[PDB]
Structure 1
């Protein structure tokens, strides 16, 4: 089991870390969601699906910078939504193919009532998402740590 990103980096068997750079909607209003879709950013596969089934959770999701300061919301993982920053580990998604499969994670971030102006700065760390991989074969339990950076400023209008 290993993963790759839309910015051309990787995390091998056994886990590790990578950086992910996301384009964000430049304007988000109070009462609306900024969507951060990681399913177009992070992809993984099973290295021996003939025998082994891989299990993958979102173990932890943490907010940073302008997201921590200026937003609240949820994370959608494989069709169900949970609070973000996270408060527990999600259920598992199965990986059972050598073909790349997206990691089905998206953040839905809504501005806090006091937010206004540049609420997320270009280049800044916005989140750290930990993917936990186990399997039905051995005792492997590996963390794939995804450091999520904004490529651009996000503004919350004062109207």
Structure 2
């Protein structure tokens, strides 16, 4: 089991970490969601689906910088909504194919009422997402750590 970003940056068998740079809606009104769809940015696959079934969760999701101070967050993992920053490990998604399959995570970030002005700075770390991979075959328990960075400023109008 291993993962890659949309630009080919890989985290190999055994886990590790990678940077993910995301374009963000430059203007987000109070009452609207800023959507960070990681399903188009992170892809994983099973290296031995002939024998092994891989299990994949979002173990933890943390917010940083302007996302932590200016937004109220929800994470969707495989269609189910949870608080972000996260309070528990998600249920497992099965990876049973060698074909790249999106990691089904998306952040929905709505501005808090105190938000206004440049709410997310360009180049800043906005989130760290820990993917945890196990299987039905051995004791492998690996972390794939995704550091999410904003490619641009995001303003909440005042």
Q: Any idea what the Cα deviations from partners look like across 1:103-138, whole Å, max 9, x if unmatched?
A: 000000011101001100011000000000000000
Contact 1:6 1:40 (8 Å CA) reproduced: yes
Q: What is the CA-CA distance between 1:8 and the residue it aligns to?
A: 2.6
Q: What is the CA-CA distance between 1:6 and the residue it aligns to?
A: 1.3
What SS does the corresponding residue of 1:81 show, helix, strand or coil?
strand
Q: What is the CA-CA distance between 1:12 and the residue it aligns to?
A: 0.2
Contact 1:7 1:21 (8 Å CA) reproduced: no
Q: What is the CA-CA distance between 1:4 and the residue it aligns to?
A: 0.3
Gaps of 5+ in 2: none
Aligned residue pairs: how many? 158
Q: What RMSD over aligned residues (CA atoms) do the two structures have, in Å?
A: 0.5
Q: What does residue 119 of structure 1 align with?
A: 119
The TM-score normalised by the length of structure 2 is: 0.99
Greater than 3 Å deviation, 4+ residue runs:
none
Q: What is the CA-CA distance between 1:60 and the residue it aligns to?
A: 0.1
What SS does the corresponding residue of 1:91 show, helix, strand or coil?
coil
Q: What is the CA-CA distance between 1:73 and the residue it aligns to?
A: 1.7
What SS does the corresponding residue of 2:145 show, helix, strand or coil?
strand
Contact 1:126 1:149 (8 Å CA) reproduced: yes
Q: What is the CA-CA distance between 1:7 and the residue it aligns to?
A: 2.9
Q: What does residue 7 of structure 1 align with?
A: 7
Q: What is the CA-CA distance between 1:148 and the residue it aligns to?
A: 0.1
